[model samples]
Target chain A: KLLKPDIERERLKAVNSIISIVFGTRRIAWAHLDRKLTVLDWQQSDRWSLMRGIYSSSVYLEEISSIISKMPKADFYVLEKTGLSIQNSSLFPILLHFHIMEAMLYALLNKTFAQDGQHQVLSMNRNAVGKHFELMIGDSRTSGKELVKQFLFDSILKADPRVFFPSDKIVHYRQMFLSTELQRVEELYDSLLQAIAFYELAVFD
Target chain B: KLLKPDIERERLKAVNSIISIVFGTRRIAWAHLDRKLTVLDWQQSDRWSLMRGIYSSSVYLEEISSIISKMPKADFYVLEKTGLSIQNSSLFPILLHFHIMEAMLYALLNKTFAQDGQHQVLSMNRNAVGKHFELMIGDSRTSGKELVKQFLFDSILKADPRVFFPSDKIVHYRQMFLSTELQRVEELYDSLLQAIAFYELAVFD
Candidate 1:
């Protein structure tokens, strides 16, 4: 009930081209899309290559900021809020790492944009995206890899696609999607799916 | 069950001089104590003065490292493991800030010491420390401010002190501790209590 007004306001602000990002400790995936949800550019990279053995927040934050700087500018930036439980002690370190990245993203992205009534950086719940795509098992969200792959296939085969992938870039993404080592590129799949879900729910629902 | 051995090992290693640190976003409090839990040196400082408003992890890490460099070296470094919950979304930014400092401390202190079987850096559970001091109320721990003040008062009248603040340094600490504005030095109180609790539980339990 408390989030109703905030959600409504976010929906109103969703009418703009945006950059969506999903990231892990070692890799980052990003997509640039217009208000109509047309993908302008998308890619995933091992951007945090400096984080090999020992984790250094300084080096990691610097590298991530530099990577975001090179990406195309958009009216808004959307990031995946990876919900990690604090009760899971073994996963606490990774959870901390993710929070550091999110903090850096929030600070860097917001500072680069306006500080008035407009919010340039927003984080959408990952589970909400999962639920919209029927990717939930009970209360938990299942991996969206297979569903994203199916979306890619349908986009290439169907005349009127749900998500409009560029004719030139479709072949490349298709090959990358079906590759034997597709698991390694899961961030890319998630990035595209997250962007599509944000448009479907937040913008046009 | 799995942590039994680890806790036992930490207990054995706790029989030496150690430096304990409790750091907030802006201020840092430290205590240097010997095996007998005698406070050799303790102070609080605005070491993060350079972190004006915008937080850069690199700059913060460098400043903390510089501050630690001038302090007396110890056989062990004890830090407070401040558990933060994901359910509390409002505290995420502060949680991130805490993790960045913890990461920097872990990396800097470990690299500056022996890497053999000996563990030089350890984090004491905040709840365990609170419980040892009878500060727990139900599942949650109460503020240690009142308890720390009680210790300061008890130290003056009691024949045997629970935690030794040097007779020479007692006057100075008492004056600072009893000031109406003692809220500002809460981190200092926590740092000392955390150090004393570590010795009592891990070394002399």
Candidate 2:
């Protein structure tokens, strides 16, 4: 989702870097929100690249778990959050990473549960997380799209979460990645914000 | 988990300096693990970070809720045991960094469920994980011991998982975080190891 148009030229390099890191290496990479700045190119050289997704509170826990239930074995690392001081957005990714681990352990001990159709002793938390995640991503009318969009704008400001990011020491005003994709990203951003705003605004109504 | 140890000392300065730097930074900021060059330390960090460092022979996914229900909110990263790496170890950090946006969104959505009791819908999956987790954590001799152990481990691991951990790195090791008493950690480690080993050894039996 492009949020800005003027900065497209400057963000081209960053987009390419992200593309190379995720698509280039043939890794099922996903971007997650966090405070750290990560360089995806480094991962390509490491070999055996798989999935990568940005983690954040907005990330649905259950959805991530579902993904894990499907892909049981894969190596991954938590990228250090770098934009804390400048543009803090670390917790979301951090939480998502944790979800990944818990889900895996859950699977290990419950081998029969995942494979079999038995669903007798289940609890509420996993479903809470899984549903939370799906509502955030899946295009559903019930999901608060306005709220999710608002969350993305904040994610964009955190850091360039692309597979490949800019190498320049400093990012100029018009050179930011979000600046180019501002409109598209903001569309989603505004939607999420509006959802939240609706509740607040509804109180008056 | 670490099979080959570097027997000969090579580039002690570089290696030592690297270790010093790693151990120097606290896991989030503290760094002591990097100071030493031991397979145990490496393996410990892997587990703390929920990297697939342990070994398990059998893998299945039946129950989940019991395990996930007790988990603190965060993203999870799982690497299942497969043909290439069959030790079948699973790892998950008790403590981790959570980004704000995602957390906020999750909180809101979770709150939404709490208000409406959307949780009951997924009792199936929850029971699935919980039953499996409870069985593994619970004792075999006693029927209800499993449930008690499951809840106990969940609360303890969740309260301040760092307590169960022994790593000086940002995240704490499981046993160290579980109990400072060396005896407790050792005992737990032995018991858990025995169970996993038994599971593996008895795969065909």
Candidate 3:
């Protein structure tokens, strides 16, 4: 519902330069999932490793090593192989939303992931895992920075935590809760690697 | 300046429910440093640890934590054994602008905090911490549910993640840094406990 076409084009115009220089902007397959999207093949990933995924979100660069240093296991996702369908080549839908989401994700979670040396970032490789978010303009890209900005910003003012989380609800409860939704977010983060198993993008790579 | 009397009144009004329950709502000390105003000796402060210094400017708790976490050990100011003093109280003067900085801190470091077991919602100590925060408001007259509703509902609408963090920013960035800043933030968090050695009022029971 928050999707927009013109704005995405505007965003892409700004991003193309960075993509061209760093990633060369290749096309790849993407899809969204209902759960904590996980790729299956990632079970075989390095005991502690990093990979990119949809949205050109960089994963497990230097920080991955840091997280692994403290953590027993580290599974990180990168954003290299996001954006379009190289498998089908015929349809290259814009994946602006995914990209934005990647940035937003990085902005929010970077601190906690580094704790105990466990970390994950976006990757570009085919082996990267998680619910493949279809690289579309309206959904993925908008979810991250822009959405937060728009809400916090109003039409004029800009804000991030300067206000609060952009989401309508806060995590857990104010008074009480035994639920490990927070921990689940972490475990599920690790589980995202499982979703990659369902895809065949890495066969040739 | 964003420090309007209306905003302070709003904050005071919002904080009143908790104030009713607290045994005391004393203004022990205050200060203004580096263009920032602070209040001291807030409620829920431990006896051994000094509870002094509240700030104006609606600064983010995470940012303060971040700054404190990174300061050189020798340079860091620990909670002193001394009780509240007029010298401390004289320091902070009200600035015209009044914004809540806690939510901003969460926005800034959501991911880094998210990866940690402590930050995870599921692993959080609900009853004890809840009680502690409830006391922060300094009130017992308000029902627990109502207190929580006031805190959570207003915060969510405002995107103010000061109270219960695990911000998207920290979460996302931990992935980006994969380890760098995330590791730094963790190191700092640990050091914070160590630095605030003689805590009086600002700690959990």
Candidate 4:
């Protein structure tokens, strides 16, 4: 019975770039996608220890500001929204971490709005995006590294691929994508996938 | 995008009684409305200190079991679901308390099931019920004593009244309804109003 009033679909489609963000218990990651469906900026900042124990709003805001300082500007920001089933009582800490980070990112990212007064930050459900790409395996979600790997490989191999990458950056990222040691972070892959899912599911659909 | 597939309207209409529950920081109150549209039971349990500080699942469950032991069984149980906007950061404690209690109640209340395997407990929206009786002023809700008072008084004074009170208990509760000292509890009034609202809004409407 409750939902956020989404900004106009035309507005989302009209946007030149979007920064899709996802956070785990410790770090925050983001992927910047342009209107051309190209990954303009992709990276993550880790070892921040954003959530260690009890949540301190002061400390969290400080870290969030630091994270935001590194991110490139975009027309919209999308945060991953998810929930564990009620039966999973053991996972409260991670669930609470997501909620806290989601709220902080939503508040900090949407600080500057357009003259039209539309909410620039939107929460995209993780399950919807996972279902869109069929990245889910049983009740749990797979790391999505394989899908990102396929996209990375497809961009180099196919003339017109689903997810486009810059010619200069493809070599650097393809090396990272192929090496298990370099691209082990799942949030790095999810960040980009969430960006593509936003364009495909929310904007195009 | 997400909604509970409510049991058939005919099923609710056929139920003999409904126990509608509401909780505050410390106390819980309920009103049992029967098929004849008369309040079969009405009272509250206080000094329970359900949410004193950090949530203890064991302690809270102990208290909940005690509370459930005293309550009259009914065909259906209704829980109050509510939320404050993101701007209302000051009210997180209460909101979290409500969510925790609502989940526990839903779990404990539905332990024993029916032969048909239907969900016996359902959550009812507080805003919809509040709007139904025009109990809101501005963003804040006014005390519903006057409405409950009218119902109590009308049960005797008017030929046809919205809420029908038991004649056997009216003389006792009429004093409680009129005396400012007796019926000052707001949750008491809300519990009954919600019970009636469920029948009027969700069932018959």
For residues A44-155, what per-residue lDDT tens digits would candidate 2 score against the true structure?
Answer: 1111222254322222333433332332221221111111121223343333343333333233323344335332111122222223334434432233334333433344
**How many residue pairs collide in each prediction?**
0, 128, 144, 0
> Cα miss at B58, model 4 (Å)?
33
- Which wins on TM-score, candidate 1 or candidate 4? 1
**Chain A TM-score vs. truth, each candidate:** 0.83, 0.18, 0.22, 0.87
Q: Model 3, chain A: how large is the TM-score?
A: 0.22
Tens-place lDDT per residue, model 1, A44-124, is: 775466535544444554466567766787876777765576545566557777756665565455432222433456677
Q: How much of the true A–B contact set does each candidate keep?
A: 0.12, 0.12, 0.08, 0.00
lDDT of 4 by residue, A1-205 (tens): 0113356667876889999888787567788999788888887775885556644333454466668778888998887767553234456556545655655455445544312345677777788778778978886687788788788876356365667889998887877666634644877888998998877776675
Worst 10 residues of 3 chain B by lDDT: B29-38
In candidate 1, stretches whose alpha carbon ends up further than 4 angstroms from where it belongs are: A1-14, A50-53, A112-114, A155-160, A179-181, B1-97, B100-180, B186-205
Model 4 chain A lowest lDDT segment of ten: A108-117
- CA shift of B22, model 4, Å: 23
Off by over 4 Å in 3: A1-100, A125-194, A197-205, B1-9, B12-68, B71-106, B109-205
Candidate 4 lDDT score at position A124: 77
lDDT of 3 by residue, A1-205 (tens): 1111112333322221110001112212122221122111211112122223221112212232233233222232333444353233233222332233333333343345324323233334322332333323543321122322232235544422222221322232211112432322222222322223322232212
lDDT, candidates in the order shown: 0.67, 0.25, 0.25, 0.69
User: What DockQ score does model 2 reach against the true complex?
Assistant: 0.07
Regions of candidate 2 where Cα sits further than 4 Å from its true position: A1-187, A190-205, B1-182, B186-205
Tens-digit per-residue lDDT, B53-135, candidate 2: 32111111211223233223311111111111112122112122112111222332232333332321110111222234343
The CAPRI category of model 3 is incorrect
Q: Which order, best to worst by DockQ?
A: 1, 2, 3, 4
Query: Candidate 1's error at B163, in angstroms?
Result: 31
lDDT, residue A159, model 3:
29
